[PDB]
Symmetry: D2
Subunit: 103 residues, 4 copies
């Protein structure tokens, strides 16, 4: 493998985790994570799209709710999709990655 692609997030879920099961039986979870920065000339929030697979996805479905504080270690992935044109979404994907609930 060439280079390093690593994301570390701590923040709060903006909604309940959505868990879907793949025909194979592999769990997949999605949720958004808020991080913010406040400074004096001000507050700016960043919303991260997190994707979890397998057991970690199942853990998210059991235990995570809107407002839950989690730690995320994942990788950046930009994927192309089209809808009713070309759209691109950059996600934080947990594959070597971990998820830990902090409350």
């Amino acid at each position: 493998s060439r280079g390093v692609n690593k994301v570390i997030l701590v923040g709060n879920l903006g909604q309940d985790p959505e868990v879907r099961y793949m025909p194979s039986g592999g769990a997949v979870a999605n949720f958004t994570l808020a991080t913010s920065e406040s400074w004096r000339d001000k507050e700016q929030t960043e919303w991260h799209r997190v994707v979890l697979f397998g057991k970690l996805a199942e853990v998210a479905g059991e235990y995570l709710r809107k407002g839950s504080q989690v730690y995320i270690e994942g990788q950046l992935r930009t994927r192309k999709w089209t809808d009713q044109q070309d759209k691109y979404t950059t996600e934080v994907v947990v594959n070597g990655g971990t998820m830990q609930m902090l409350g």
Copy 2:
């Protein structure tokens, strides 16, 4: 300051850095990282392209010394910004932004 938003990358510039002066400098370039896995059986490979943006001294350093193919270490944060393109379509871009608490190191 509320939560943690941290990106760490090691990779190679996909082109020469674009440097513009505002007085603070702003530089941008793309970074390739790749993972290689073996098929279930051939050595396969996928590259990920990251959009990096630098501000101040780091941007100026990038313009001086970085070129297409340079290997760098980046520590920054994620920012998704919205723009409408000239067709009226709302578009979003996620970039890796290196401000003060971030670094860039040439390897």
Copy 3:
């Protein structure tokens, strides 16, 4: 600079932060932070904070507090009553932070 020296910790304070003032007047906080892998084994990390963050730690942190630490490794040499001793600490530098995560361990 030359190379990268980065430690990232999430865990719980082993004791109350010890805050002392240096001759210079700068604040310094010291405490231990526990991390564990599960068979279960605990790693105790020696954390050192300086200035405003150290005072913040003394005000608001207690034994059992969950914190996030971003710092760097420093091994410092000190002699005992006369053998040479070394301690490796996680020191929160310019580019580092400490963030209170809320919640606390019990007994």
Copy 4:
């Protein structure tokens, strides 16, 4: 599994890696890694340099890869965790060593 214990290093080997094989059969490698930072004292204006030497330990394939390809002065990327281990020395002194340990879930990457 409880909390987070992560070290990230980029630096240069201070020696060739020593690779011993355990009786179990798994390889173990160790070497020291130098990281340095340079800054100008904001109060005094002086230029300052400080080097930090890290003790790295690798297991399994990475240990073997290190023995094959890494040498003194090689630039590597390390991701691992901190471990402090206790030992009494032949003089009877309790001693402590903090190492950067790369197990499963860590990586070692040759740079350049």
